[PDB]
Design goal:
The structure is a homotetramer. Chain A is mostly beta strands and 263 residues long. Chain A has helices at 2-9, 28-41, 125-128, 170-181, and strands at residues 12-15, 18-21, 47-56, 66-75, 79-88, 91-102, 109-110, 136-140, 155-162, 202-213, 223-233, 236-245, 250-262. Chain A has a single domain (1-263), classed as Beta Barrel (Porin). Chains A and B meet through strand 3, strand 5, strand 6, strand 7 and strand 10 of A and strand 3, strand 5, strand 6, strand 7 and strand 10 of B. Strand 11 of chain C pairs antiparallel with strand 7 (109-110) of chain D, so a sheet runs across the interface. The PDB classes it as hydrolase.
Chain lengths: 263, 265, 263, 269
């Protein structure tokens, strides 16, 4: 199941900077993961991803391949930048610009990971379904039922870990973390309003998704996703995320804005 | 100084989606502010900027103008999206993708503005600077002054009140262009605060990689706004900052995120 | 009136590969000449134009400028290639790809200039009309009536020369020859059907225009434009042209297909 | 041989406007025929190609696929225009703009086919090439019968005109578009070497560098390539280390079906 997700994030090469991906409406995290893979193939091997910004323009159709075209923007003394277009039926469904940097020691500092319960104690989402294994095991701190909200603070904490063995290749961990970053995210914005994201009449859609990979990490041990929604207004919802490993290291940050509209 | 900037953010048009901008090495906020104008021209009148992401690829040259090419990406039922290339000397120096939406009523919540002293007690940057040195288009009153030449191990937070140094039209578009400009002040340098180095100290290579912004709510820049910045991380010869901009009455008007090179050599 | 073309082809630079040119529908030759200037600005000094191919997508608007955006396609050991996009009202009206080569010594041969009366005995188009000044003086072997017309062979011969003394810069002669190359051309295809090119309800417009500059030349001495229409079929007419100088040297060849339609 | 080429010119679809073609350096005719196929897939079914212009920028490699990217430039009331990029190793080897139009009735005239001996009395290139093959030996996709033979390894000073009859080697489908792709392919044979005739150098002699720069074509009238067509070629000029050739293609009954123009590099080292 992980095996199958990883196989799917490993794209078929059509030509330099033209890739073709299969699908698991497509999960945004699939398009993100796949686009990272596509961009990374066009960069020097040593320069790993440190940031990306993306916009989702159209929904992706899960029954059809997605073509990833990669435009080489710049290769400098430190940075390589690439723009990925995800294409289906001759139309872009998503664009990402990503940047890549050689690892190098420099100034170090970070904030503090929130105080939360460890994972061992907590029930998985698959287990809370008991009242097929998922590629990524999620263990929430607090369960937020998608079919009935309740007015809650705009904060959500979730431990997550790859459901299986991961290879010793940090690039693969980065693609999967890109995938993983689009779970348990945007719905956090509905929490003060008491509506679950899958309730009748709720229109919820990602507009943009951006991520910064600060430090190395592995997804075969537990990471914590700390999400806050600092704002909602104008039928949009805004969420900021930070991903910590179990020892407290700040590994990645994320930002996302989406449509949140009750009909 | 403000009328000059405001004229300078008012772009010379060449065609539908091509614009030329005069410069004031170029200040990142200028490029950001110019690029926003460029995109907003190509969008339908009811739709205002709600977000942008940009990357800086090459330093701009202050002695020459900048061409802004604007690609139309999509015109949806509510959202329009534009990509702006900033071109100098045959080469792109900057790329922004921005999104615009019609003002609409929906779910409202926000976090809480940090408690800080009001602007009235506080000295402006120009005045502080004068001790260890003219009119500036935007006035800045820091809560705590972080000296660009000196500096000590401080918490990676910063708080700065700002306001336009002059008179502003009643066109919200121009405020937004100006807020894009102002968001690139007092920002990335916060990432040096834990390391006891000021950003103008010799050997300090500091440079913006990317700048992104989300305009949550309407505002005016002819009254005082607060910029609350934190550097949540630095590693790998990068520094990372997040910002939030609040009006006096506490309304969260915009958020920003930027990563840059920080290297002492 | 020639001084005002040579200035009108000396394009205003915006940035490297971006060009503004005043208009005088725009002619076509105007667009070709400006396009050729735009491209030559982007190429190494030693390399002069040897060929272009162009398509016409939309009618120009004489009231407004045209931007000419130039993509660099290749810079080889001998040849450089450029694609010029002529933009007005945020739409492309015309595209040209042009190739440039430095003058070099090689194999020489050519065909023979048609047998026609010399220009010295011939009336100019300004004299037959007498029966404002023109930038290029034209003396036709046979004047055709653009609002009348009768059936003749699909061949046309006209001598031409710039109405004025031109600079010693070969580039400007080439821009001007490109301009001149769209005069007395496409109408030739009507000659066999008895219809003038200003007759009412006759739809006529250049689809494509291509040229090869075989040899150096001056447009401040007589050149002969020798034009045949070898075909017309499906609302298109096809012409081929060859341009010889006074002494019989073949300097350029042309080819054009155009819409020719009876409403 | 014909079957194999027709299967090569029928490209694999990767997405809207993105196709990949296998190779028989790459013969220009293959690139041309494949590019017309690519462009035609993106245009309405009734609008057939009437013209194209192309530049060759780098040699193609036969051992690897070619990706054809098709850009939509305009779909107007009558005309659809498309620009095809042939890509290999992330670089363009060739660009083509092609225009397509609705088959209809309008003014009809043409020049006259040159009077040449018919193909029945003429030997084929493959039969003639026996005796020097030790330009080509076994079955070819298109049978060529030249009016005069031009030995690629030994020139003789001759006028800059060439006339050759040609035809597909086998039954072709009843689809015109295939005939057009295959005619695009055929149009690059017996063409640029015509420019060497006055200079008495065979196009395959040691030191002769000959390379297509551009290739353009106009499809005037419908035709079939499973009956004899005449390629009438002339070289009107050479200079500057370039050679210039114009072609006109006639069917046996005298109809002018297509015209062609190419310039190439012709340099003796």
């Amino acid at each position: 199941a992980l095996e199958k997700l990883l196989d799917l994030l490993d794209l078929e090469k059509i030509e330099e900077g033209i890739f073709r991906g299969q699908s698991e409406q497509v999960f945004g995290g699939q398009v993100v993961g796949q686009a990272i893979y596509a961009a990374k193939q066009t960069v020097p091997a040593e320069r790993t991803v440190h940031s990306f910004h993306s916009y989702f323009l159209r929904p992706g159709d899960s029954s059809k391949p997605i073509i990833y075209d990669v435009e080489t923007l710049r290769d400098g003394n430190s940075f390589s930048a690439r723009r990925v277009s995800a294409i289906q039926n001759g139309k872009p469904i998503f664009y990402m610009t990503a940047s890549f940097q050689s690892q190098e020691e420099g100034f170090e500092h970070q904030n503090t990971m929130p105080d939360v319960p460890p994972p061992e104690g907590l029930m998985s989402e698959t287990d809370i379904a008991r009242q097929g294994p998922q590629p990524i095991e999620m263990r929430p701190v607090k369960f937020h039922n998608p079919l009935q909200g309740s007015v809650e603070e705009p904060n959500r904490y979730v431990w997550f870990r790859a459901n299986g063995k991961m290879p010793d290749d940090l690039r693969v961990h980065q693609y999967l973390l890109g995938y993983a970053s689009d779970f348990n995210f945007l719905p956090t914005a509905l929490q003060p309003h008491g509506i679950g994201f899958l309730e009748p009449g709720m229109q919820i859609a990602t507009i943009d998704h951006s991520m910064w990979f600060h430090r190395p990490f592995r997804l075969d041990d537990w990471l914590l996703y700390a999400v806050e929604s600092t704002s909602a207004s104008g039928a949009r919802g805004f969420v900021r995320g930070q991903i910590y490993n179990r020892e407290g290291v700040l590994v990645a940050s994320t930002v996302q804005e989406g449509v949140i509209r009750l009909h």
